[PDB]
Design a protein around this ligand. Structure first.
Ligand SMILES: CC(C)(COP(=O)(O)OP(=O)(O)OC[C@H]1O[C@@H](n2cnc3c(N)ncnc32)[C@H](O)[C@@H]1OP(=O)(O)O)[C@@H](O)C(=O)NCCC(=O)NCCSO
Ligand SMILES: CC(C)(COP(=O)(O)OP(=O)(O)OC[C@H]1O[C@@H](n2cnc3c(N)ncnc32)[C@H](O)[C@@H]1OP(=O)(O)O)[C@@H](O)C(=O)NCCC(=O)NCCSO
Ligand SMILES: CC(C)(COP(=O)(O)OP(=O)(O)OC[C@H]1O[C@@H](n2cnc3c(N)ncnc32)[C@H](O)[C@@H]1OP(=O)(O)O)[C@@H](O)C(=O)NCCC(=O)NCCSO
Ligand SMILES: CC(C)(COP(=O)(O)OP(=O)(O)OC[C@H]1O[C@@H](n2cnc3c(N)ncnc32)[C@H](O)[C@@H]1OP(=O)(O)O)[C@@H](O)C(=O)NCCC(=O)NCCSO
Ligand SMILES: [Cl-]
Ligand SMILES: [Cl-]
Ligand SMILES: [Cl-]
Ligand SMILES: [Cl-]
Lengths: 234, 234, 234, 131
């Protein structure tokens, strides 16, 4: 009915600072679609094992394990850059951020050392972070040390996106809604395919188009063909 | 023929100033597709009535009314921030800008108080703004006071886009070309769907992903299910 | 399993500088899908004439010639602006850059004077630039004078992208992976269509949405209907 | 107690949803015998939903000093032709208007009924002008 001016205060002040700092990063965008038909089936077969263990298993633990496997081949995506992009710190831990918005705005807790965790341990840790997130009881150690982020915008809606990189990280992916679409198979028959879009932003001062693209193709081959993941897990 | 250097002058200076000011806004992109099969059919039913009343009825009056209804639920999308983004002004009037290009460049008049205007009054005012716009006759009061912008790039071409936010607004949507695509219905049969893409940009210092995504899903439910709009209009 | 700090040095310094200068450009993005079914067929028929002449003929020569044709109608897209964007230099030569990542190296050699070259001459020069490109032997003259850029990300992967404009240029296009998708023909029958995505970025200080979109529609008509190119070539 | 005719105030500035809200409120009070004076007075036009129980057509009695009343019959599925000429399931409802013919002529009641019916047969017609 009438205009109203309000302070930006509290835990809101941090998104202002974080996003302002991201203006120093020249964002390159690269996007793709990934055929999740096989993963959808896989997850349905694994759901009762996870539920029998008291864990909810979404698609995120798969996306995270695949990003970790890709980041081992393209370690420059799990790196940080200094004040005027003069030196690159290759970071060994894959502490991968889960962007969540609470009844308080943006919170980005991370799963620590994804590289040494099984898909099941990741699911476990995701459930612990969601439980604390929704309670507003995430601790400092859950929030610091992030090295890469994924934003599952599709748990709510969307296709493509242009996510903003979280300084001092150099990359972020946004995942869209998994949707059944008509797609051709090998024999050229119109089939039901479970398609998801992915939108990557990368700091183009240090990350070139080919690196993000090859990383993305690798992440994508692991999800399209989850058996590729098996080959090198211990 | 040979290189020719040339002053940017007169009205062309304003887009330079406007777009350069937009560099201060950390843009977040969120996109989606909307199924407009039912709206396309509905617009065909209404076309003859609007025509009898001397109005061209396009899709815009629908997009605008659905945007207004969505903004009632997500009022922070119809708001401004100050230089530092220290304070937010929630703006009560939905003065929704219509980006148009003329030979002197970018011109964004707005429809005042969309929230108390019907789809037919919105179409009338759009028609008035287009005529004036093309004749170079927009008033100062047609141009000032905008609180939110839509850009129908799809009147010319395109699917997705990354629109630039117009300070001091915090969000803008770009609408792509409505195109027929093969999509599944609930029976799981390949049907002819009229699909349109939407691309929202939002000032990420104060707007998080969930807000823009929930707003978008609401706008989109009103357009996919126009019955939804009827429930709360008077 | 330890972090490692490493200087950015050598030809890695140049991408930092270029991409940081690009932060001063307010990027507008505009995207589309192009139906390349006829072109895929056309290239297949020319491929054997190309081989006989000792030339590999990809899609890029077609993309390059159609861009040069559109740039003739929309010369503002082949222009540069100054520091504070007070003067436009319309550049006569179409020196179209081909963004390449080597092992080096974001490197962007260009095809000089595309406006006076046949598709086969463009393919010849592309082959030369690819040969020297992969040997790290591209010369200074191959690298300078660029006026517009295309980035074939789809040689590796992708659908849409957000490419970064290369100062002092005002536009860049990124081309996604050509992929067969079910699409309707005029009869409303589900056909196999070779679809490619294009993502344009343009300096919205001097380039409006209508210009990039009409240019894109023109480029796209030339590729969807390659007969249109025949009419006006000499 | 027999006949009770509360009314919804100023329908012209109310949404379908606010009208539903007021109907529920009036139904609830009506059935507790708790309708207020204000609920009961000021009526300008009346509808009687006979079809909540049964019926097709009816002859409703106008309520002085109003000039018109409509009675709504039971909605039911009847075989009807589409525009192709195929036999379709159609949900058919009858409406019966009574109007004071000293001042309301037949063209007025018919034209009003045709407009009322257009809005219900084609609901998007309501979308056009609601705010
Ligand atoms: C000022 C304005 C936003 C006005 O746009 P508008 O209100 O949608 O209508 P318009 O530009 O007059 O175009 C109307 C026609 O274009 C079409 N059109 C408009 N937007 C469209 C879209 N996103 N996709 C497909 N067709 C579209 C049809 O709606 C209409 O076609 P017919 O009436 O011939 O069936 C726009 O002209 C502009 O970008 N400048
Ligand atoms: C915290 C979290 C990432 C966790 O996501 P998650 O691990 O998928 O868990 P969830 O939300 O409980 O998922 C529940 C259901 O949604 C489904 N789902 C999740 N992501 C999906 C996607 N991209 N597409 C389709 N379905 C999805 C899951 O399959 C699950 O389905 P069932 O209940 O049928 O098994 C998510 O809830 C969230 O907050 N994401 C929002 C991202 C965001 O807000 N980013 C904005 C950008 S800037 O502020
Ligand atoms: C420098 C360059 C832009 C040159 O690209 P180019 O002119 O396509 O040559 P190329 O990369 O050698 O392409 C060779 C093959 O890739 C294919 N290809 C290239 N771009 C493609 C796209 N966007 N989608 C699908 N296939 C593509 C060509 O069809 C060609 O296939 P065949 O030889 O099997 O017919 C690129 O190598 C690069 O990104 N760097
Ligand atoms: C108060 C009132 C005038 C109006 O009642 P109302 O607003 O239609 O609600 P109601 O009578 O509770 O309706 C109960 C059910 O009968 C149905 N019904 C009401 N009027 C109908 C009609 N004319 N034809 C067919 N079905 C009807 C409703 O749709 C509702 O359906 P469901 O519960 O199956 O979804 C009437 O109940 C009365 O006689 N007093
Ligand atoms: Cl940028
Ligand atoms: Cl940004
Ligand atoms: Cl910008
Ligand atoms: Cl598609």
């Amino acid at each position: 009915g009438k205009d109203r001016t309000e302070p930006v205060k509290g835990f809101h002040k941090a998104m202002v600072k974080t996003m302002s700092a991201a203006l120093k990063i020249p964002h390159f965008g690269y996007c793709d679609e990934v055929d999740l038909t096989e993963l959808v089936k896989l997850r349905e077969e694994l759901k009762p094992i996870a539920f029998a263990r008291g864990i909810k298993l979404s698609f995120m633990p798969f996306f995270l394990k695949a990003a970790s496997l890709g980041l081992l081949q393209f370690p420059i995506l799990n790196a940080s850059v200094d004040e005027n992009c003069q030196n690159i710190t290759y970071k060994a831990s894959h502490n991968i951020g889960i962007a969540m918005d609470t009844e308080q705005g943006l919170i980005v807790p991370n799963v620590k050392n994804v590289q040494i965790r099984s898909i099941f341990e990741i699911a476990t840790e995701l459930n612990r972070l969601q439980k604390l997130g929704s309670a507003g009881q995430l601790s400092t150690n859950d929030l610091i040390g992030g090295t890469f982020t994924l934003s599952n915008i599709g748990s709510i809606g969307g296709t493509y996106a242009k996510p903003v990189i979280l300084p001092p990280e150099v990359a972020i992916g946004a995942l869209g809604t998994i949707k059944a679409l008509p797609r051709f198979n090998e024999k050229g028959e119109v089939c039901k395919a479970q398609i998801m879009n992915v939108s990557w932003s990368a700091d183009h001062r240090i990350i070139d188009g080919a690196t993000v693209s090859r990383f993305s193709n690798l992440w994508k081959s692991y999800l399209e063909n989850p058996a590729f993941m098996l080959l090198d897990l211990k």
